[PDB]
A = this chain, B = another copy of it.
Amino acid sequence: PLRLGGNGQLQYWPFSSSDLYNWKNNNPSFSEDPGKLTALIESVLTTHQPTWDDCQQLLGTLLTGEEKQRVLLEARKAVRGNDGRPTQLPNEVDAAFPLERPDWDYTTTEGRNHLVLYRQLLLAGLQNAGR
């Protein structure tokens, strides 16, 4: 998670495991009730302001391996180009929703915006994967 510390600089702290496992146990799977976990992951995408890595923990914990692969397939299928329009160009798809840890520096506008896009794209991945 990211938040402001008592100096107005963003500050990282990892998820506590308690929260992640609570979230798991107190909800049905993704397949039995996909909009339950989606509602939750979605709220958390804002409240906890998670990084790329934070998202991998969220996803890895709350989803089965192939629940997760669908989610990413779909997040990636939803990428848009500069032009506002869909793109499936491999390099733009990877730049918006990379599968391997990117180098987004969360203290710059570029990294923060990349993160904003990432979560939006993840969310759309969960929504599409569900329906």
Number of interface residues of A (CB under 8 A): 37
Q: Tell me if A101 is interfacial: C-beta within 8 Å of chain B.
A: yes
Residue with the highest number of chain B CB atoms closer than 10 Å, among A14, A17, A24, A54: A17
Binds B, one of A5-13, A80-88, A91-99: A5-13
CB distance from A114 to the nearest CB of B (A): 16
Copies of the protein in its oligomer: 6
Residue contact B40 to A46, C-beta cutoff 8 Å: no
CB-defined interface of A89-130 with B at 8 Å, one 1/0 digit per residue? 000000000000100000100000000000000000000000
Within 8 A of B (CB), among A1-39: 1, 3-9, 11-19, 21-24, 26, 39
How far is A116 from B23 in the complex, measured between Cα atoms in Å?
29
Residues of the B chain whose Cβ atoms lie less than 8 Å from the Cβ of A19: 16-18
Residue contact A3 to B12, C-beta cutoff 8 Å: yes
Residue contact B46 to A101, C-beta cutoff 8 Å: yes
How far is A110 from B50 in the complex, measured between Cα atoms in Å?
26
Residues of the B chain whose Cβ atoms lie less than 8 Å from the Cβ of A5: 6-8, 11
Q: Which 4 A-B pairs rank lowest in CB-CB distance, beginning with the nearest? A: A5-B6, A17-B22, A6-B6, A14-B47
